[PDB]
Write an enzyme that holds these catalytic residues in place. Structure first.
Site: not given
Ligand code: NTM
Ligand code: NTM
Ligand code: NTM
Ligand code: NTM
Ligand code: NTM
Ligand code: NTM
Lengths: 265, 265, 265, 265, 265, 265
Positions: B143
């Site tokens: 994000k």
């Molecule tokens: O996509 C990822 O790398 C990711 C890794 C851990 C937690 N959230 C995400 C996300 O972007 O929603």
């Protein structure tokens, strides 16, 4: 009128979107390969109270990912998944190949969350400094995120705030540096006018009465006092006099984001 | 070692810097014209307690603006203009044509303030969830700010946090969507492995015991439980079990910025 | 045949058009916001006697601005709003969102006016130096507008003139500099041939009889005399001998423009 | 002050120069191969009376071609190889590898000839409409060459003329189209102001007295009458009333070029 | 003369090199971080008999990686680490920061191995079809690697072969398709000439006597017979008549590579 | 699953295709002008036994050239115009304007021939070293063609081989250089881990038993022996032990091409 109409039907901003996709997929999209192209349905959820912004940008992402979207709310709308009758609110319905949806997802949400956050902070500040009966304007700055100025300025507008000057090629902003660089505010302003011409305003930052006054006589269009002509104070976060403009990076810089999510049916 | 060594001597990131300059000067630099090219001296000030980050990026801005800089602090240093013996701290000395200094200023400061902010938040969180005696790691997410991923991931590292996966072409991250898209976690993982190969890890998000266990037997390298193999929980902001990884966009997304300023002698 | 077929269905020239739009809208299109997207009708007017040129380029602008156009005249047509039964002539009918029409307008007209001007001057010169019974050809030069060579060469062709060599990678053009750089016209021509091969012609600028003759024996394909083989004289503006080619930047450089305009119904 | 200081030490304009070189050499430079890298001396000649302009652009070409140049005249200087004591005037001395000089030559001269031509026409017109005792200003338009706006606007300035508005993102320019699109000049101006804010001026084109007057009351900064507030007339070529601005594409569009040449010692 | 002089001191090819670096480092260079910037010495080794080629390209990689190189052999030299007195041959000495050397390594070697391979195959074929006493030329094709045409054509030249036509904008090459598209070879050639002009040659592929002959009378510069005027046969791999040109993709397409390596002292 | 799904619906690879077209048409397409836009039918022929690959890339070329294509074979199919019942096999049917077909032709065929060649060699090698009963994997390298890595890696996959690491930003690969640069394999691996984190594997090249063993204890994910953890040998062309990975540039570098052709009805 429609804010998204500020964006030219075609220009560099659409290439910005393409590059944001490339930034996420330098080589292959392994997940897109495992999920496939079967058509799927998806809801875009807003999970935090705030103003919806960045719609035309998220839509360009969806367009380039060849998806069909239907927005349930007009941009600029204040959402309040406050209820948590579910805790969230479907702001858009999406349809298209599974892989295409999951590819657009993070980039689209990164745009909405940040654009909505800026809009939300911008709105909070103007409405706030409205409620006092202030009739002037609240403006932003040039302290934008590198490479993301168009998006953030656009969000300031949707929030109900003034963008202030877009860049260094727009309104001239003179300081002490420029002033004694030519000999006097008058000279600085005269040399600025000599190159910017009539189409663009000149703003001079002062710190005293006389200073302001020589700038006015020199032809300055705005005078910044900082912590025929308009007056502006810059920095001020929590004061409202009867100045015309109050500038603060608070409506766009280091602001909280508004959480969104996307889920396939 | 030196973090800035992660950046290739030459690549797209240097062109990113050029584009950030162009984003600020679409046509002419009126102020640069009024100030001139006389050599000047300037101090870069840090006006808020936090960790210094983004040095190699700010330096590239200074390099392209043909200036001479001397950093008074190593990147990663925690600054504490806490004293306000003046309220600020000179972190760099700059010399070069007046116009060139004022041109690099806002872009350079926009980089430092945001990179330092991310680093500072990243450090606060790991050190915090260190102090509990936790031995695992705190990671980021995808994000990130559109177009600014390299800079923000780099800042996560300087802060002492794990970047987590860089993009969608790096570690595969499978979810329910991919799972029943092939028939079972086993299939999803097998198809992912079929294209990513041995060089890249596969992570599967589960929600139960068995699920985790079939993923392990399928060959998954990481298992996300979410709110030979490693374990990760994602979302968690304020809980520390003996999981290996805790992911949170909190160390990089919607974080406060660290204020900097630049002034000519 | 159709001249516009010289342009590849897709290539850099279409990106040139996109960049010309971006050059006009670095940030926002304020006018497009005030006018809106209501469908509108518009006539493209030619307000000066001259040959129509630049149609495929103007059309690409219209295409990217998502408009519907109908050209009333084939490219290459000589228009004569000479009558001023109104003083102008509708050469195209346009339909589409108000904002989209006003955005394409100036860029599209900047293309038509300049491409038509070049075509018109090119045609005037060849037809002129036709009417004398001259059977040779009139050619252009490399003194084109920076960044606009494809468009101007294309306009030379529509005008009925030869483009002459497109660039430095096309026909080799040797001068005294190259000649005594190797020892003799023979050497210069031999080294040129050594790298350009059989697919590309070699032209040598001479100033005497013998010189021309050694170039011929060396293998030169063209000989420029300047103010199996072809002969060319360069500079000549107002002389026609029985040379094969007369080169002059007059048909494309510093030429008057043909005025066009666009108006919504 | 120095006009060339308007150009940022680094930005897209320098990449424009690189692209102009690529436009001339898509593959190989056959001539550069036959001439070699021996150091050579060269004089840049001005062969027509007019004002020197485009110096910083030609210099960037020379810089990228790794040559050493010494300008014998400041930009903005009026040259008069009128004498033809030789018929020309050495404006610069160049040194560097033979091939590098011949590569920069045509591109550099294409810039000087066109930039000087625009400057020369701009100067002729203002000085002319000076000599009448007119105190207002003469401005340009947006009818610039596609892709070459920065260079041509810059040349207008050196000539002593006003650039007028740079693009559609700078001063808002409202017409009848926008006016009745919202209901009245007042609405059009109010919606424009709603998005451009205080930093940018709004100009409204009128055709009557009342119209002008409602625009003034609406907040318009400029009023165009066309063939607290400023007044402008547009089109006018050969009339001078006591208006503030006279706009004409004559100082930059379809103007004659100033001939230059380059020769190795 | 020097082959590398064919490359313009600056143009798109240098940006190609930058992009090849970016293609190898989308985010961070982990290895460069672990190795550091200590100055190091390195030898570039040629591990297979063949002709050295691609020197200017590999040098640009080294230049952008800020290293110091000294080539021990001129480009075009035939190397014979045949001896295996060690089995390899130091062709260049490199010095610079450890990380910078290891970053340039693979990209630089990918260029040398492939450019040398093409050169080596090109040379083998011409020298071979020399040794028979053939006086004509051996040429390449347009079947080059996408995005790598400049490099491969350049390698053909160093090998001692003709590049043949660079692209579709260079020599016109007409076939049956174009022929009956206009009605006859004469028409096809006349329409081609109508747009390419005198500066560029027209080649027509025939299959009979008469066909060749009408092309000659039409003005064709070359006639391809395929498996005042020149004659060419295309395809032929292992035949030599007294034709002028023999075209074969064999000297550049699907050719073996020449192995190189780089090692730090 | 479908291999082409690895490619993001939109990203830089589609711009690569556009650039490959521009590389073939710097100015005008003379042949396209002589042939015209009449709709035509065309068959794409495979003229050599091998595996079909590069379909999505060739299709993008066809898409940008606005043509209608129908593939008669799924990508990955082994073709055997072995029969020469004609000697070739129609793999696709194309329809569209004459000029558009001839423009896409060479670029499309340059992609298919090279991608199929890589796939074919990759398949030959794995199937070969399958038939021995080897259960491990055969992988590629980073010795790819500059600018064409996405296409070649993709072809390795279709062939049934492992890509190995995509670039320097993916799996860390440590050597002696990095090892004694920090003091020991342990340090090198610890510093690598310090920046790559858990999401990316670390590979260390060893040459002895102990060395391998300290790498294992340091946390290395792979150990290269070269001519919890996996084992790999690199170079090996014609040996199969029970190692996990055998790396060889043979499946992608310097491989023969598979001949294709295109003909209008
Ligand atoms: O996509 C990822 O790398 C990711 C890794 C851990 C937690 N959230 C995400 C996300 O972007 O929603
Ligand atoms: O530069 C500006 O536009 C600006 C305007 C008001 C307040 N601050 C700034 C700034 O960026 O520092
Ligand atoms: O260079 C050319 O193509 C050319 C051809 C004929 C006359 N002049 C020129 C020139 O550009 O100076
Ligand atoms: O649009 C402008 O800036 C402009 C300003 C004055 C006169 N004409 C124009 C025009 O381009 O049509
Ligand atoms: O097109 C060419 O230049 C060419 C020239 C000779 C032989 N083949 C070709 C080809 O690419 O098919
Ligand atoms: O660098 C790699 O990825 C690689 C992996 C295995 C074998 N060789 C290499 C190489 O490119 O030299």
């Amino acid at each position: 009128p429609v804010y998204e109409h500020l964006l030219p039907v075609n220009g560099a901003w659409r290439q910005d979107v393409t590059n944001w996709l490339s930034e996420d997929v330098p080589s292959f999209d392994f997940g897109g390969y495992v999920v496939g192209s079967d058509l799927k349905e998806a809801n875009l959820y807003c999970k935090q109270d705030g103003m919806l912004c960045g719609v035309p940008f998220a839509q360009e992402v969806f367009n380039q990912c060849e998806l069909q979207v239907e927005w349930l709310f007009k941009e600029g709308s204040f959402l309040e998944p406050s209820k948590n009758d579910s805790g969230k609110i479907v702001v858009a319905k999406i349809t298209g190949p599974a892989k295409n949806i999951l590819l657009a997802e993070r980039t689209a949400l990164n745009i909405l969350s940040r654009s909505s956050g800026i809009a939300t902070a911008s709105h909070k500040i103007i409405s706030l400094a409205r409620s006092t009966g202030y009739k002037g304007t609240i403006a932003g700055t040039r302290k934008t995120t590198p490479g993301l100025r168009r998006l953030e300025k656009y969000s300031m507008l949707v929030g109900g705030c003034d963008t202030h000057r877009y860049d260094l090629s727009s309104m001239v902003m003179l300081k002490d540096n420029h002033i004694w660089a030519t000999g006097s505010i008058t000279n600085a302003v005269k040399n600025a006018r000599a190159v910017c011409g009539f189409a663009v305003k000149i703003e001079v930052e002062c710190l005293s009465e006389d200073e302001a006054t020589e700038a006015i006589e020199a032809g300055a269009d705005v005078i910044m006092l900082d912590n025929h002509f308009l007056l502006e104070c810059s920095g001020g976060l929590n004061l409202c006099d009867d100045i015309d403009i109050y500038s603060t990076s608070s409506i766009h810089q280091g602001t909280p984001v508004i959480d969104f999510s996307l889920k396939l049916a």
